[PDB]
From a paper:
ATP hydrolysis/synthesis in F1 is coupled to proton flow in F0 through the rotation of a common shaft. The γε rotor in the F1 domain (α3β3γ1δ1ε1) is surrounded by a cylinder composed of three noncatalytic α and three catalytic β subunits arranged alternately.
After focused 3D classification using a mask covering the F1 domain, we obtained the following two structures: F1 with the up form of ε subunit from 526,524 particles at 2.6 Å resolution and F1 with the down form of ε subunit from 39,991 particles at 3.3 Å resolution. In contrast, the structure of F0F1 with the extended ε-CT was similar to the ND-wt-F0F1 structure, except the nucleotide occupancy of “open in βE with ATPγS,” “closed in βTP with ADP,” and “open in βDP with ADP”. These results indicate that the extended ε-CT hampers the conformational change of the F1 domain from the inhibitory conformation with “open in βE,” “closed in βTP,” and “open in βDP” to the Walker structure with “open in βE,” “closed in βTP,” and “closed in βDP” during ATP hydrolysis. In another wt-F0F1 structure exposed to 4 mM ATPγS concentration, the ε-inhibited structure, which adopted “open in βE,” “closed in βTP,” and “open in βDP,” was maintained, although all nucleotide binding sites were occupied with ADP or ATPγS. This indicates that the inhibited wt-F0F1 structure by the extended ε subunit is not activated by ATP binding to βE or βDP, and that the conformational change of the ε subunit by ATP binding is crucial for the activation of wt-F0F1 for ATP hydrolysis activity.
Numbering used by the authors:
A (entry chain A): 24 to 501
B (entry chain F): 232 to 471
C (entry chain E): 1 to 470
D (entry chain G): 229 to 284
E (entry chain B): 24 to 377
F (entry chain D): 232 to 352
Write the structure that this text describes.
């Protein structure tokens, strides 16, 4: 009589204990008497531990629980594009129902080692620092880590916006964020037209912990549907730390044994399972790809914590945002010394690969000598040139909000910087020099831009040398 | 042992010396037993009743109207951590404490007593005299200043110090070395007979050192020396 | 009947109840194979490993895959033995998981092939070799300054992009060519795309045919990642014991094995130790490392990459790992950018075998003289940079002149490096290396150009290169 | 005077080099102390968490 | 029957729990049906806690456990000289059985205050630095402490070899060491002829924790047999840190609350009980002696750690081996500043004193 | 206090101020009461439901079509440790910070807001 029907024994803090439900599966979806949904996580000898996916105030001891017989799954399809939904797939923007016709489970095996192909296609974020020093390829997963108010969300929004003219599908997952910030981000995406190819999954701080726990798996489930069809998908995770906190809360309320920092034993397994589903499929599998950009928030720059170390060990690269650099006026404040990309090189076009080598060395040389700049002349033969070159390099890498740059213009400006054409321009005028140089290239440099776009390689040296000289003839130093 | 001492204190009214070789082992044994008794562990795994048990043991060791007991107890500090609960809680039960440091022992200074951590309630002008109190306070002040100058000395050396600080370091080295002494017991290790120094001689020697009377002697002549005249004798034997 | 029954499912931990008097032994493998009866069920194909006997005929196990879809009451089959993997010639050139099932697309192993358990006691004291002997690798730097002991453990350190993979491939090629042995690679906690890249690098280098590869990915449960090293070790042990040859065993990262063990212990509910690791850390590490030894028949020697958390060499896992190492190889980016491959640091690398009782008097003397010359050259760097070459005395000029040639002669052309340069490569015996370095130290070749000593091999080849240069 | 100026500059250079070396050695020791403190803190935290869990 | 036969309830991580065994006594040896030995540790109201002294994979719930009637014991005798055995006394070198006649308990009281005599006889190690600066007397406990690969084992091997012409019996106990190193040590001892008076007790790193925990006690129990007959014995514990780690593992498997560095409260008592048994007996008790040389491994030369400070407060001095001196070619790398011998001086001969 | 402010936000469409003198005490009281309820301890002794409670309190302070509630919250940081879980979870909701310095007050500058320490999104 208790094969498919249960009775609640205990209720508290979003966790319910039920008697019966003999045939329930591990991870199955269950329904309470008042219509609130639940997920069965703890199958014990005489009771079932159920995590409640909604307001638990209406649930009392002795209530009836019915099982649905379905493993946790989310709707998928093209109808989700341009809409805001919760981790259960229910729309929250108020624009009506979603017309999806099929679903896939949130937990599915990752592609095998023989189903993949080496990463070889660049992903243009539109940010000079990332595209030059820490390249990202399609199928790579790259970690963005930094303190509060350092610009991680700005980087995510910029790289999502930059995918307008590329055959790319973007999925933005917000875990534990404020609803106001999500509303403003959605409005910005609508304003810039990125909503025509973007899906937004939201789970705010006021939502129950299981929704925050399940949101990233809903994101990958939605992405994989396009991945296996032959398309390219970008998935952004606004906070994995809040996912870890929610999962720790659920585990502690279920009285599972705790580990370091009260996290459960399988906390690393959770993140590895989530992040291993991003891959670059082989030609036999259709050639699709999915790339991930998880976010981790540190406290006072402490990257030695448990979750940051786990995520660093899992991902293929890191991008460090420094609070002091942001305060100093260097934005988007990417620390090139600590940032690294293990896939780098193969994820760049030929021209960018040609020009980034000198830039890396110049920035590395400048950073170590920066502490000695305030004492003036140390060695005027070499050190003074190094300091000026590094200052101009730092000025070049600065960028404003919501203004992605095409890769060809980045290549041209980096070439101009590295070849010494900016050595006579004062440091205070580099930003205006670049801004006017882009307009000059639009007006007169169309052939160079077209050649770079078509062949992915630098044009003839004399041609762009003459173009830069002609532009410099018109530029006026203030 | 305490019961045997208490009998002599009370029933005969006699003066008793009580030596306890390591009182920390009592607390350690209590900690070992506590877990099997069913008590939940305390901060560093100790028993919850550490303070109560130690107080019950210590409060019986007192001088009363009928007799006097003076007790000398050696207290072990685990892993040289003076913030460990067992050494920390036993501080409030003592009238005078002597703190030994491994750094001073490694420097070759014996008995390696820390001159600033050690305290006593008897160091008062009305108990030891005005001259003794002033000399002790001046010695402690000079040692504190020398401790403050340590980072500057370690990084930039002695060259950047002012004239006043250089003299402070000069006299502090002599004061630190003169606090060492040769023991009768230590003769088995070094072969040096050892010495017994009266209080007035110690006060006079430190007063003379503070006045700069022996600034010209090498600092090595002050090691394990006893009285102040032996410093001059050692310096003369060294060829000064 | 030996049929179990699932009673508790809590993440990767599953409890199974058996009939009285028929409990499976510890470390036995249990199989769950369930076909969905109706629309409210999901097909299950899962393997469990017995961990504890809880009493009341209940056994606590850890799963080797996802536990989603399990239902209380499902029957469990006891195999009567630990996890068994295929062994023999059939494993060469294949890729396996922890369960021993082939991962590549070349088909499955026949069911009648021989299989061996991955849990086994270490070889007995009386079965061990009584003499220490050197493994000749054919690489001048390793054979001279950091010799490898047959049956010993070697730790490999270095930054990214310095050439660790090329060195591993060269070691496999040289051992297979000269000693007739094979190699086994164990990818403990390896990233899937990096595993695919490594497989393709092995494939196009032509060395895949002489090695067996076993992968445990990061997305597998902690139980699976803990046992993959034992699978690779069993595959190596078959060749050590049944054919009596010398085998190489490569472990991708033993720190990931340690942390997987810690996670499993945390899941089982044991109290942690030290800085948070499992109480059985030393026991597990010893049980893994003591099976890599030299016996009367053959030997297994292991090259292990070790990650040091927070750069703390006193951390319990690095300490218990270093307790077993016999040699250390360090790769420096400076030598790589200078162009002298394999870029092994001649001063940071150390070996326990570099003693006159093992390698001989002349070998030890030559190695010590070379180390002293390189140390003097390193000390002279600031003086020659600031005071100038002219300021150096005659002895300083002579030692610089000798040390540059010694440093260049440490470089070697690898067989697997032909794909980058087209140079065939060479294998250099240890005696030739010792003789060549002794001759260089005597000044016999002071008149030759310094760039003729680069990527050369033997000492006659540098003479031939100098003659070619004119 | 010229000789004295040259000697003064050389002496200042040498003194600064020695000070830098001393600072590097101090950092080297402080790193070991920091590592010991970190390990002790992690051990204490995990022990307290496990004791609190066992108390129930 | 039931008073002498038990039934296993729980098995895990080398710890077993059994029902029955009414007449079993604390510390008694028990035997499983598999042939593996065990020690009765806890006598609860309805069950007995058993520590398994061997491979526990062959033990399953429901197996039979039977009493042996003997408190923890190891065989002793002169027939054990020249053999390599495990902590239980079973031969390991494969040269056949050991024909011993007597046994001694693992746990025994140390000699009393009035049963001892001051140390007055030198122990010539054959090493100039030790014999000159840090003399060791017969009956002394001298700690050897240093970092990894600083020559600790070589000093002990040379000391054992030097005892060829002296009336000394040597016992070498290897705890948690690699089997290959023990094999090579045995080979070099045979080469130098030290096996005529040496007993080797081994418990490698692959062995379960209880054997590593029990090995030093087995060694000292073997030594006491000659010690109480009027002879002189030298005992070397190759690593007490491994024993401490094994005991910590065993305690935490029993869910005992840990202290600093996760060590149990009785970690000091563990070493003190072992090291108090080495003594120089008075003339009334035959005048025998037992000398102990415990080993401790430090991390980055930190002498202020928990275990090193625990051991230092027990022994009569320490010999400190420094890593940088060893790397600079100074071998043995004895740090004269930190090394000291409290009992020494009175042990040296008149010629060496001068 | 929040439910008193919500009436004026909703039923009258006003823009109101909500002052909280020490938001840290809310989490402190939650941690104090959680232990007796039978919950397992969190990382440094706090309740496992810290983030959920903080979010449920904070998300009710929002701007809507009818009106808005804006909150000025004084925050106490124990021992100035910004890595403590309660300040860490509190800071994730803040949009701007106002820092007061006694140095400016001593110089006669009021309201003595630090120009460089204060930041706003
Ligand atoms: N490139 C940039 N140039 C100028 N301002 C920038 C830039 N990137 C970000 N900012 C500003 O930095 C502030 C914080 O940015 P953002 O919201 O992206 O931070 P965050 O790291 O996601 O932090 P949090 O989510 O914790 O509030 C905002 O005021 C934003 O306008
Ligand atoms: N002996 C060699 N001869 C020529 N080139 C070499 C040699 N060793 C390494 N290289 C060069 O190094 C690169 C390959 O390095 P490799 O992949 O082996 O290093 P790694 O440290 O294992 O890298 P990663 O961490 O990215 O896996 C190529 O550019 C190759 O040309
Ligand atoms: N006096 C010596 N002269 C030369 N070599 C020596 C000397 N003493 C020791 N060695 C060598 O130093 C190395 C390490 O010494 P040893 O194994 O005795 O040290 P250990 O501290 O016991 O090491 P481990 O931690 O590996 O057990 C060995 O190769 C040994 O041969
Ligand atoms: Mg943000
Ligand atoms: Mg590689
Ligand atoms: Mg040793």
């Amino acid at each position: 009589q208790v094969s498919d029907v249960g009775t609640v024994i205990q209720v508290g803090d979003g966790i319910a204990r039920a008697h019966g439900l003999d045939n329930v599966m591990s991870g199955e979806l269950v329904e309470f008497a008042n219509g609130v949904m639940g997920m069965a996580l703890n199958l014990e000898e005489n009771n079932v531990g159920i995590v409640i996916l909604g307001p638990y105030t209406g649930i009392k001891e002795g209530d009836e629980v019915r099982r649905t017989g379905r493993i946790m799954e989310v709707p998928v399809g093209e109808a989700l594009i341009g809409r805001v939904v919760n981790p259960l797939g229910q729309p929250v923007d108020g624009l009506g129902p979603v017309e999806t016709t099929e679903t896939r489970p949130i937990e599915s095996p990752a592609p095998g080692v023989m189903d993949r192909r080496s990463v070889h296609e660049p992903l243009q974020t539109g940010i000079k620092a990332i595209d030059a020093l820490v390249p990202i390829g399609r199928g790579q997963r790259e970690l963005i880590i930094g303190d509060r108010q350092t610009g991680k969300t700005s980087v995510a929004i910029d790289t999502i916006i930059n995918q307008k003219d590329q055959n790319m599908i973007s999925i933005y997952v917000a875990i534990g964020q404020k609803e106001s910030t999500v509303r403003t981000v959605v409005e910005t995406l609508r304003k810039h037209g990125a909503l025509d190819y973007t899906i937004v999954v939201t789970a705010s701080a006021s939502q129950p912990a299981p929704l925050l726990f399940l949101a990233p798996y809903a994101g990958v489930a939605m992405g994989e549907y396009f991945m296996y069809k032959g398309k390219h998908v970008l998935v952004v995770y606004d906070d994995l730390s809040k996912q870890a906190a929610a999962y720790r809360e659920l585990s502690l309320l279920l009285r599972r044994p705790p580990g370091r920092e009260a996290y459960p034993g399988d906390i690393f397994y959770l993140h590895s399972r989530l992040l291993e589903r991003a891959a670059k499929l082989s030609d036999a599998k259709g050639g699709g790809s999915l790339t991930a950009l998880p976010f981790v928030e540190t406290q006072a720059g402490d990257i030695s914590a448990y979750i940051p170390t786990n995520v660093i060990s899992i991902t293929d690269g890191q991008i460090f945002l420094q609070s002091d650099l942001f305060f100093s006026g260097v934005r988007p404040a990417i620390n090139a010394g600590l940032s690294v990309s293990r896939v780098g090189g193969a994820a760049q076009i030929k021209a960018m690969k040609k020009v980034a080598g000198t830039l890396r060395l110049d920035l590395a040389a400048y950073r170590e000598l920066e502490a000695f700049a305030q004492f003036g002349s140390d060695l005027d033969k070499a050190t003074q040139a190094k300091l000026a070159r590094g200052a101009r390099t730092v000025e070049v890498l600065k960028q404003d909000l919501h203004q992605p740059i095409p890769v060809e213009k980045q290549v041209l400006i980096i070439y101009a910087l590295t070849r010494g054409f900016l050595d006579d321009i004062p440091v205070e005028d580099v930003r205006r020099f670049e801004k006017e140089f882009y307009l000059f290239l639009d007006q007169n440099g169309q052939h160079l831009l077209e050649h770079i776009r078509t062949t992915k390689d630098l044009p003839n040296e004399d041609d762009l040398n003459k173009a830069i000289e002609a532009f410099k003839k018109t530029f006026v130093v203030s | 042992g305490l019961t045997m001492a208490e009998y002599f204190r009370d029933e005969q009214g006699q003066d008793v010396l009580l030596f306890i070789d390591n009182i920390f082992r009592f607390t350690q044994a209590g900690s070992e037993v506590s877990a099997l008794l069913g008590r939940m562990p305390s901060a560093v795994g100790y028993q919850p009743t550490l303070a109560t048990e130690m107080g019950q043991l210590q409060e019986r060791i007192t001088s009363t109207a009928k007799g006097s007991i003076t007790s000398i107890q050696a207290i072990y500090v685990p892993a040289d951590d003076y913030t460990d609960p067992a050494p920390a809680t036993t501080f409030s039960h003592l009238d005078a404490t002597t703190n030994l440091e491994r750094k001073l022992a490694e420097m070759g200074i014996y008995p390696a007593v820390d001159p600033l951590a050690s305290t006593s309630r008897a160091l008062a002008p009305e108990i030891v005299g005005e001259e003794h109190y002033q000399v002790a306070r001046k010695v402690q002040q000079t040692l504190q200043r020398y401790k403050e100058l340590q980072d500057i000395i370690a990084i930039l050396g002695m060259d950047e110090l002012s004239d006043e600080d250089k003299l402070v370091v000069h006299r502090a080295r002599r004061i630190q070395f003169f606090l060492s002494q040769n023991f009768h017991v230590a003769e088995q290790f070094t072969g040096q007979p050892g010495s017994y120094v009266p209080v007035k001689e110690t006060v006079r020697g430190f007063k003379e050192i503070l006045e700069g009377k022996y600034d010209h002697l090498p600092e090595d002549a002050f090691r394990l020396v006893g009285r102040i005249e032996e410093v001059v004798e050692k310096a003369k034997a060294m060829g000064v | 009947m030996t049929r179990g029954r699932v009673i508790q499912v809590m993440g990767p931990v599953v409890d199974v109840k058996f009939e009285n008097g028929h409990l499976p032994a510890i470390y036995n493998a249990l199989k769950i194979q369930h076909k969905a009866r109706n629309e409210n069920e999901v097909d299950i194909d899962l393997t469990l490993e017995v961990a504890l006997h809880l009493g009341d005929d209940t056994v606590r196990t850890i799963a080797m895959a996802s536990t989603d879809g399990l239902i209380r009451g499902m029957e469990v089959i006891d195999t009567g033995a630990p996890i068994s993997v295929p062994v023999g010639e059939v494993t060469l050139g294949r890729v396996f998981n922890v369960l021993g099932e082939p991962i590549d697309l070349e088909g499955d192993i026949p069911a009648d092939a021989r299989r061996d358990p991955i849990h086994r006691p270490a070889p007995k004291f009386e079965e061990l070799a009584t003499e220490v002997e050197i493994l000749e690798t054919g690489i001048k730097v390793v054979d001279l300054l950091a010799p490898y002991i047959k049956g010993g453990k070697i730790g490999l350190f270095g930054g990214a992009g310095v050439g660790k993979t090329v060195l591993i491939q060269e070691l496999i090629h040289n051992i297979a060519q000269e000693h007739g042995g094979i190699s086994v690679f164990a990818g403990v906690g390896e990233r899937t795309r990096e595993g695919n890249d490594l497989y393709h690098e092995m494939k196009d280098s032509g060395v895949i045919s002489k090695t067996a590869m076993v992968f445990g990915q990061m997305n597998e449960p902690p139980g699976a990642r803990m046992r993959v090293a034992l699978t690779g070790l069993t595959m190596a042990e078959y060749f050590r014991d049944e054919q009596g040859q010398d085998v190489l065993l490569f472990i991708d990262n033993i720190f990931r094995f340690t942390q997987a063990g810690s996670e499993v212990s945390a899941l089982l509910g044991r109290m942690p130790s030290a800085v948070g690791y499992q109480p059985t850390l030393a026991t597990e590490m010893g049980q893994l490392q003591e099976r890599i030894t030299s016996t009367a028949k053959g030997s297994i020697t292991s090259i292990q990459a070790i990650y040091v958390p927070a750069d703390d060499y006193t951390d319990p896992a690095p300490a218990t790992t270093f307790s077993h190492l016999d040699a250390t190889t360090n790769l420096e980016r400076k030598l790589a950018e200078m162009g002298i491959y394999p870029a092994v640091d001649p001063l940071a690398s150390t070996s326990r075998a570099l003693a006159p009782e093992i390698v001989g008097e002349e070998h030890y003397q030559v190695a010590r003289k070379v180390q002293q010359t390189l140390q003097r050259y390193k000390e002279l760097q600031d003086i020659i940079a600031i005071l100038g070459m002219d300021e150096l005395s005659d002895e300083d000029k002579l030692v610089v002149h000798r040390a540059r040639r010694i440093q260049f002669f440490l470089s070697q052309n690898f067989h697997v490096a032909e794909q980058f340069t087209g140079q065939p490569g060479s294998y250099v015996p240890v005696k030739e290396t010792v003789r060549g370095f002794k001759e260089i130290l005597e000044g016999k070749y002071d008149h030759l150009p310094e760039d003729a000593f680069r990527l050369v091999g033997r000492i006659e080849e540098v003479v031939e290169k100098a003659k070619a240069m004119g | 005077l010229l000789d004295a100026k040259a000697s003064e500059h050389a002496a200042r250079m040498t003194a600064m080099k020695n000070a830098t070396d001393n600072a590097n050695e101090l950092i080297r020791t402080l790193t070991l102390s920091y590592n010991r403190a970190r390990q002790a803190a992690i051990t204490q935290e995990i022990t307290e968490i496990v004791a609190g869990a066992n108390a129930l």
